[PDB]
Design a protein around this motif. Structure first.
Motif, PDB file in Angstrom:
ATOM      1  N   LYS A   1      -5.238   8.591  -2.585  1.00  0.00           N
ATOM      2  CA  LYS A   1      -5.589   7.291  -3.175  1.00  0.00           C
ATOM      3  C   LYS A   1      -4.368   6.425  -2.502  1.00  0.00           C
ATOM      4  CE  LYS A   1      -8.033   7.395  -6.699  1.00  0.00           C
ATOM      5  NZ  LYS A   1      -8.245   7.687  -8.108  1.00  0.00           N
ATOM      6  N   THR A   2      -4.714   5.193  -2.459  1.00  0.00           N
ATOM      7  CA  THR A   2      -3.761   4.109  -1.915  1.00  0.00           C
ATOM      8  C   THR A   2      -3.546   3.118  -3.036  1.00  0.00           C
ATOM      9  OG1 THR A   2      -4.269   4.639   0.267  1.00  0.00           O
ATOM     10  CG2 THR A   2      -3.130   2.641  -0.016  1.00  0.00           C
TER      11      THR A   2
ATOM     12  N   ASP B   1       0.854  -1.347  -0.234  1.00  0.00           N
ATOM     13  CA  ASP B   1       0.018   0.037  -0.144  1.00  0.00           C
ATOM     14  C   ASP B   1       0.940   1.258  -0.088  1.00  0.00           C
ATOM     15  OD1 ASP B   1      -3.162  -0.542   0.869  1.00  0.00           O
ATOM     16  OD2 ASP B   1      -1.735  -2.274   1.321  1.00  0.00           O
ATOM     17  N   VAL B   2       0.557   2.181  -1.086  1.00  0.00           N
ATOM     18  CA  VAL B   2       1.454   3.279  -1.172  1.00  0.00           C
ATOM     19  C   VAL B   2       0.507   4.348  -1.371  1.00  0.00           C
ATOM     20  CG1 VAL B   2       3.276   2.091  -2.102  1.00  0.00           C
ATOM     21  CG2 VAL B   2       1.515   2.980  -3.667  1.00  0.00           C
ATOM     22  N   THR B   3       0.758   5.539  -0.871  1.00  0.00           N
ATOM     23  CA  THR B   3       0.031   6.453  -0.664  1.00  0.00           C
ATOM     24  C   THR B   3       0.360   7.513  -1.772  1.00  0.00           C
ATOM     25  OG1 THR B   3      -1.190   8.338   0.550  1.00  0.00           O
ATOM     26  CG2 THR B   3       1.259   7.864   1.240  1.00  0.00           C
ATOM     27  N   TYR B   4      -0.697   7.825  -2.687  1.00  0.00           N
ATOM     28  CA  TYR B   4      -0.534   8.852  -3.704  1.00  0.00           C
ATOM     29  C   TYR B   4      -1.617   9.908  -3.615  1.00  0.00           C
ATOM     30  CZ  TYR B   4      -0.851  10.734  -8.396  1.00  0.00           C
ATOM     31  OH  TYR B   4      -1.255  11.291  -9.744  1.00  0.00           O
TER      32      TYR B   4
ATOM     33  N   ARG C   1       9.411   7.888  -6.946  1.00  0.00           N
ATOM     34  CA  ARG C   1       9.379   9.047  -5.994  1.00  0.00           C
ATOM     35  C   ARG C   1       8.226   9.511  -5.876  1.00  0.00           C
ATOM     36  NH1 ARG C   1      13.036  11.519 -11.077  1.00  0.00           N
ATOM     37  NH2 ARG C   1      11.590  10.568 -12.852  1.00  0.00           N
ATOM     38  N   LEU C   2       7.127   9.200  -6.647  1.00  0.00           N
ATOM     39  CA  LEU C   2       5.762   9.625  -6.063  1.00  0.00           C
ATOM     40  C   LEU C   2       5.054   8.491  -5.151  1.00  0.00           C
ATOM     41  CD1 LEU C   2       4.039  11.990  -7.451  1.00  0.00           C
ATOM     42  CD2 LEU C   2       6.368  11.481  -8.513  1.00  0.00           C
ATOM     43  N   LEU C   3       5.652   7.628  -4.940  1.00  0.00           N
ATOM     44  CA  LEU C   3       4.973   6.573  -4.041  1.00  0.00           C
ATOM     45  C   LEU C   3       5.817   6.848  -2.585  1.00  0.00           C
ATOM     46  CD1 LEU C   3       4.547   5.460  -6.918  1.00  0.00           C
ATOM     47  CD2 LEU C   3       4.699   3.161  -6.009  1.00  0.00           C
TER      48      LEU C   3
ATOM     49  N   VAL D   1       7.452   2.249 -11.244  1.00  0.00           N
ATOM     50  CA  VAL D   1       6.541   1.023 -10.674  1.00  0.00           C
ATOM     51  C   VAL D   1       5.351   1.142 -11.260  1.00  0.00           C
ATOM     52  CG1 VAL D   1       5.783   0.524  -8.151  1.00  0.00           C
ATOM     53  CG2 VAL D   1       7.504   2.108  -8.476  1.00  0.00           C
ATOM     54  N   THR D   2       4.846  -0.074 -11.330  1.00  0.00           N
ATOM     55  CA  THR D   2       3.593  -0.726 -12.149  1.00  0.00           C
ATOM     56  C   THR D   2       2.549  -0.897 -10.646  1.00  0.00           C
ATOM     57  OG1 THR D   2       4.458  -1.564 -13.921  1.00  0.00           O
ATOM     58  CG2 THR D   2       2.212  -2.069 -13.450  1.00  0.00           C
ATOM     59  N   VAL D   3       1.699  -0.287 -10.508  1.00  0.00           N
ATOM     60  CA  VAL D   3       0.865  -0.540  -9.603  1.00  0.00           C
ATOM     61  C   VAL D   3      -0.858  -0.601  -9.819  1.00  0.00           C
ATOM     62  CG1 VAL D   3       2.182   1.180  -7.934  1.00  0.00           C
ATOM     63  CG2 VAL D   3       0.151   2.174  -9.194  1.00  0.00           C
TER      64      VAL D   3
END
Length: 62
Positions: free
Chosen positions: A20-21, A9-12, A47-49, A32-34
């Motif tokens: 959004k997570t 879970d990364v926060t963007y 760097r956005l994650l 990164v492919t998410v």
């Protein structure tokens, strides 16, 4: 390799302020492919994650 895992879970936060997570699916260098909360798959910059728990609480002094 920064320590991102699959399904992580990364926060963007978008420009719209949308917090959004995402789930990390695969990782390639700085990209990164998410997977999105809706299930869209996106490619973002690592760097956005921001990890769900960043060094906000555990930060070595100020």
């Amino acid at each position: 390799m920064d320590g991102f895992d699959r399904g992580a879970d990364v926060t963007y936060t978008d420009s719209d302020g949308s917090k959004k997570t995402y789930k990390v699916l695969s990782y390639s260098g700085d990209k990164v492919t998410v997977q999105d909360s809706d299930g869209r798959t996106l490619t973002f910059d690592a760097r956005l994650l921001r990890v769900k728990k960043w060094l906000e609480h555990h930060h070595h002094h100020h």
